[PDB]
């Protein structure tokens, strides 16, 4: 498997998540889902996000969604769009530590 090349990406297998410059939109599209700077200042967790990001068409490209989607947030229903980012943190909560499972020191 695999996916296709795209010039118009803003995130990149270098940096990561620019929360400093976070597009307000997209800040809630975290919050909501239960996401903290944590797993989006991590280079390792950066882009096993970046798949919903990424998937999801676009992080500019969400806007026009969200736009349609809700209005200037609030709390009215918290699912829709956000109940998806859920589950693909679930995936990395169910690992604890199996895949630096191996001890070879003795004693
Ligand atoms: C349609 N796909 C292929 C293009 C990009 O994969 C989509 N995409 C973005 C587009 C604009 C900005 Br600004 C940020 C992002 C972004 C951030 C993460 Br993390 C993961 C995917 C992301």
């Known amino acids: 498997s695999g ?5 118009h990406v ?16 997209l800040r809630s599209l975290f919050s909501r889902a239960g996401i903290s700077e944590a797993q989006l200042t991590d280079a390792e967790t950066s882009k096993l996000i970046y798949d919903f990001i990424e ?7 969400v806007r026009q ?11 009215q229903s918290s699912e829709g ?11 990395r909560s169910r690992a604890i530590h ?7 020191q003795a004693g």
């Open 81 to 91: 769009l956000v109940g998806a980012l859920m589950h693909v943190m679930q995936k």
């Open 55 to 61: 998937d999801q068409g676009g992080l500019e490209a």
């Open 10 to 25: 803003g995130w990149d297998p270098q940096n990561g998540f620019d929360v400093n410059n976070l597009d307000p939109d």
């Open 65 to 75: 969604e969200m736009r349609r989607q809700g209005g200037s947030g609030g709390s």
């Open 98 to 104: 199996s895949s630096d499972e191996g001890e070879d």
């Open 3 to 7: 996916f296709k090349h795209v010039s």
